[PDB]
């Protein structure tokens, strides 16, 4: 009832998500399944997420990411890191050690513990598409495995990407499921046959 919305809205700017066409080889650290709308990635590795827009949001626009549990009986529970990982210092001195989602390669990164919902989120300033690219790419890191006991503990999660203005007004929203694991390529292949 107080759970964050995961409803898709492209909004004024035609906000869409995009992902690299990376394939499923062993060496891949991040691979996306268009069939599943699901990202398979490695712990603490680079996870490119693309922002596609029909119109450019003004400077000052922010991009927020938040994880929630997929299943209804776990949706009220705040997605956080497991004790083991929250106890180690893989902490970059910006991210709170409890946050599952980080952004790498951005010194303007901002982290939030919601005063009321206790939910974690990470936000970065929106920048217009790179040279030689028609989208804007953000590098996320997931700091726990899906399997991590005492954390997600094999419970499936979604990442909600929100576009908001400098004043916090919602502009658009999208989402994708993510599975954090040692063999992203292997698992994508497996889950894509599981449809059949
Ligand atoms: Zn963990």
Residue numbers in the entry: 95 to 290
What text comes from the article?
The tumor suppressor p53 acts as a DNA sequence-specific transcription factor regulating and activating the expression of a range of target genes in response to genotoxic stress. This in turn initiates a cascade of signal transduction pathways leading to different cellular responses including cell-cycle arrest and apoptosis that are known to prevent cancer development (1–4). p53 binds as a tetramer to specific response elements consisting mainly of two decameric half-sites separated by a variable number of base pairs. The majority of tumor-related p53 mutations, particularly those defined as mutational ‘hotspots’, occur within the DNA-binding core domain of p53 (10). R273, a DNA-contact amino acid, is one of the most frequently altered residues in human cancer (6.4% of all somatic mutations), with mutations to histidine (46.6%) and to cysteine (39.1%) being most common.
